[PDB]
Amino acid sequence: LMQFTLPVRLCKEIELFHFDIGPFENMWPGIFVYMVHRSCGTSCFELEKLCRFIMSVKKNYRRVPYHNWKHAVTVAHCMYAILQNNHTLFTDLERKGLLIACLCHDLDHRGFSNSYLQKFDHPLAALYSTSTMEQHHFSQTVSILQLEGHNIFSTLSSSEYEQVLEIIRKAIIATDLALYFGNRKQLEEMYQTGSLNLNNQSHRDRVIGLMMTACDLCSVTKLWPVTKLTANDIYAEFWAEGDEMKKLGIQPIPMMDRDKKDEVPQGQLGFYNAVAIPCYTTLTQILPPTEPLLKACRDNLSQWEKVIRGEE
Ligand SMILES: Cc1ncc(C)n2nc(/C=C/c3nc(-c4cn[nH]c4)nn3C)nc12
Ligand SMILES: [Mg+2]
Ligand SMILES: [Zn+2]
Ligand SMILES: [Zn+2]
Numbered sequence: 171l172m173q174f175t176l177p178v179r180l181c182k183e184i185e186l187f188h189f190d191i192g193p194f195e196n197m198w199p200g201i202f203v204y205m206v207h208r209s210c211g212t213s214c215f216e217l218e219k220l221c222r223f224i225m226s227v228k229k230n231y232r233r234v235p236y237h238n239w240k241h242a243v244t245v246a247h248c249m250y251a252i253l254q255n256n257h258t259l260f261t262d263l264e265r266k267g268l269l270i271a272c273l274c275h276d277l278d279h280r281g282f283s284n285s286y287l288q289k290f291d292h293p294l295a296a297l298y299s300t301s302t303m304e305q306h307h308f309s310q311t312v313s314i315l316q317l318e319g320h321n322i323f324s325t326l327s328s329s330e331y332e333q334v335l336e337i338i339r340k341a342i343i344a345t346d347l348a349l350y351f352g353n354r355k356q357l358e359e360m361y362q363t364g365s366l367n368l369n370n371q372s373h374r375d376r377v378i379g380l381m382m383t384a385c386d387l388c389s390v391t392k393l394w395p396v397t398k399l400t401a402n403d404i405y406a407e408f409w410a411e412g413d414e415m416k417k418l419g420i421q422p423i424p425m426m427d428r429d430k431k432d433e434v435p436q437g438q439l440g441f442y443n444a445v446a447i448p449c450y451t452t453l454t455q456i457l458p459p460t461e462p463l464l465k466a467c468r469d470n471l472s473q474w475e476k477v478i479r480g481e482e
Contacts, residue, residue, distance in 0.1 A: 171212055174204040187251045187388075187462045190396050191243050198243045199224050202273060205250040210265045215322045223322045226314045227273055234281035235406040246272035248385035248463075255459040259368070263330060267337035268378070270311075270322070272385055274338070275345050277310035279303060281407045282414070284346070289418060301346040308342040337378070344379035345386050350445070353379045354452050361455050377456055384453050384463060390446045391466040394473045405434065435477045442471040 176184065183189050184201070191201055202224060206214060231239040249272045253265055260268075284302045287295045298305040312335070315321055323331050344353070357376050360366040367373050389400040412426030424430045425437060450464035476482035 172217065173212065174200055174207060176201065176204055184247070185251070185254065187248065187460075188392050188396075188466055189247055189251070190392060191240065191247060195240070198239070199228070202243055202246060202269075205247065206269055209250050209253045209269065210262075214266055216325075219319060219322045219324070223314065223320050224273070226317060226320060227277065230277050230310060230314065232278065232280060234279065235410075236400075236403040237276050237279035237281055237407065242273050242276060245275060245385045245388065248272075248388040248391075249381065252381055252385065252457070252460055256457050259457070263326075263334050264337060264378070266323075267334045268341060268381075271338040271341035271382070274311040274314075275307055275342050275382070275386070276303075277307045277314070279307070282411050284348070286411050286414060289415070289420060301343050301349065304343050304346045307345075308339050311338060311342065340375055341378055341382050344382040347383070347445070349379070350383045350449070354383075354448060357452050357456065361452070366456070380449070380453055380456070383449055384460070387446055387449060388463070390442065390470055391450070391463045392470075394470060397470050397473070401434075401438070435474055438474040439471070439478070442467065442474065447471065 175181065180192075180201070184204070191198055199221070203217075203220060206220065227242070228239050231237075231242060246269050249268055253260060253268065282290075284295075284300075287302050292302075294306055295302050315323070323334055326334060343349070353376055357366070357380055360373065360376075368377070389397055389404070391397075392400065408426045409428035412422035412428055415422035415426065421427075424433055446467050447464075450460070450467045454461045454464045473482065
């Protein structure tokens with residue numbers, strides 16, 4: 171059969187957590203398929219269906235600065251790295267569902283937060299009162315799966331099909347950062363009282379939730395120049411939302427106010443300390459081989475400290 175292969179540098183580097191998928195948009199589908207093939211098997215999906223699914227997903231990401239098709243592939247690569255470093259811990263359905271979930275997790279994102287849609291009173295905020303964008307992302311995923319010739323899961327049974335869509339749904343909902351805090355606290359407690367048990371479905375669910383937050387936040391786990399340049403795209407969305415808040419007559423939070431550009435280094439610090447570090451710590455406790463994410467995150471915190479001290 172037809173095995174996708176990548177040039178030597180990418181073949182080697184794609185296995186590392188800190189891999190950057192590069193600026194050549196046209197290689198991103200092949201990179202993703204390569205990942206599916208190695209973490210799942212060349213047999214997981216009908217190549218033609220998979221190819222068709224990928225291109226529809228791509229077409230349904232928008233040309234926004236950060237929440238775009240490059241982000242989808244990036245988050246899916248992080249998941250690939252997690253799965254490859256924890257070979258025996260995941261079921262066949264999970265390996266299948268999770269890369270698709272990551273590719274799909276921000277489908278049709280407009281560059282605006284849940285909180286902005288609520289204040290704008292967007293129709294989606296009446297449809298989905300919490301995790302507004304995320305329930306939309308999963309809705310878009312099902313739509314795409316139901317297009318003619320796009321059903322990459324067609325060869326599973328009815329109940330395996332329902333299980334995989336259930337994995338994907340929960341994984342996608344989990345990318346709502348509002349839900350991460352309590353999820354990580356539960357996980358922390360279960361781990362430390364020794365009650366964490368991966369045969370309990372509701373525990374796996376939590377752990378897969380955490381992996382989703384880890385993959386989603388993985389720009390903070392890259393080489394410093396990648397992390398720093400990604401931060402620009404992130405803030406370009408934040409500030410556009412800030413402007414839109416001002417248009418509705420609402421002072422945005424500082425994160426989103428382009429007049430407070432100076433406080434960015436200090437805002438990154440708060441974020442690494444309140445969100446990122448806790449996230450990769452708990453993940454490393456649960457899944458030891460994901461430690462390089464924690465180590466990379468801490469290096470980047472240290473880089474933001476240097477920026478504040480004027481050394482950078
Ligand atoms: C790197 C990153 N990846 C994902 C996500 C959701 N985030 N969120 C942040 C936010 C940082 C931040 N910046 C300011 C601020 C700026 N100027 N003044 C204050 N506050 N905060 C909280 N940063 C990230
Ligand atoms: Mg999202
Ligand atoms: Zn996001
Ligand atoms: Zn995302």
